[PDB]
Amino acid sequence: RNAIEYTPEMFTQVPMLYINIEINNYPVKAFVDTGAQTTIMSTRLAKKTGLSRMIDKRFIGEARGVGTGKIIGRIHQAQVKIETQYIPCSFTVLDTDIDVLIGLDMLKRHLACVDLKENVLRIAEVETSFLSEAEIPK
Amino acid sequence: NAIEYTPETQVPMLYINIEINNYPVKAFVDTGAQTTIMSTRLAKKTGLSRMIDKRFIIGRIHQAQVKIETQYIPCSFTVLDTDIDVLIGLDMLKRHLACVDLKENVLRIAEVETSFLSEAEIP
């Protein structure tokens, strides 16, 4: 045509926020959820990583919206490796396909910045990239 | 030979103050949700019900301006019948290059910065 009109549009992928962490040298993809009141670890992962002895079965209850919601116990402290730093985290343990969900409690505790401009999570003294759609567990 | 009971501190959720068509709204900031949502009720009150696209959840609002501090930020909403009037999800946090800053307790979105609300102010 005699004239060419340019009408730009943005296309933005919106994958769920995940990061790579390590728990007792086991690589784990962790879900970053500011809408969660607690931080979760699956029974499968707690057992695999040798953290089951520290599942304190005095602390139960419900975490509605993940698995069956039935809490098995609390891991009061387990060191989580994020890049070059170990950081202490607490976990609500339940039967779920989500290995680790980092909730608002742990994000606040470690003064996190969830940076969607730069696509990274800054937590404690480290920075780690959000996973691409291809690396995200489904 | 056992008992169960509620213990004798809950983390407050992230909320911010926003205005839609001059109506003050307390918005839930949720990275666990892919999609930003607006209640049917708020769409009615703010005069956005006529902007709900119904082609296949009530529908989608494609562009509505959200006022944060002194600036307007265009957002899209999936309209549901819900108690939560606005839930800001990953789509709008990514679109507006946001930072959820828990060190300073603020949300940086588009070109503005706004404080998270106190526990007493949460809906």
Numbering used by the authors:
A (entry chain B): 188 to 325
B (entry chain A): 189 to 196, 199 to 246, 258 to 324
The authors write:
Yeast Ddi1 has three structural domains. It has an N-terminal UBL domain that shares only 14% sequence identity with ubiquitin. Yeast Ddi1 also bears a C-terminal UBA domain that is found only in plants, fungi, and invertebrates, but not in vertebrate Ddi1 orthologs.
We obtained a new crystal structure of the RVP domain of Ddi1 (residues 185–325) at 1.8 Å resolution. The asymmetric unit consists of two chains, which form a dimer with non-crystallographic C2 symmetry. In the new structure, electron density is visible for the N-terminal segment spanning residues 185–199. Intriguingly, this N-terminal segment binds into the active site (Asp220) of an adjacent protease dimer in a different asymmetric unit. Nonetheless, while the observed arrangement is a likely an artefact of crystallization, the N-terminal segment acts as pseudo-substrate and reveals how Ddi1 might engage a substrate. The N-terminus adopts a β-strand conformation that interacts extensively with a loop formed by residues 245–258. There are multiple hydrogen bonds between the backbone atoms of the pseudo-substrate and the loop, suggesting that it might be involved in positioning the substrate for catalysis. The side chain of Phe246, which is conserved as an aromatic residue across Ddi1 orthologs, interacts with a methionine in the N-terminal fragment, suggesting this may be a specificity determinant for the protease activity of Ddi1. In Ddi1, the flap does not wrap around the pseudo-substrate, thus leaving it solvent-exposed. The structure also reveals how Ddi1 could cleave a peptide bond: the catalytic residue Asp220 holds an ordered water molecule in place, which may act as the nucleophile for peptide bond hydrolysis.
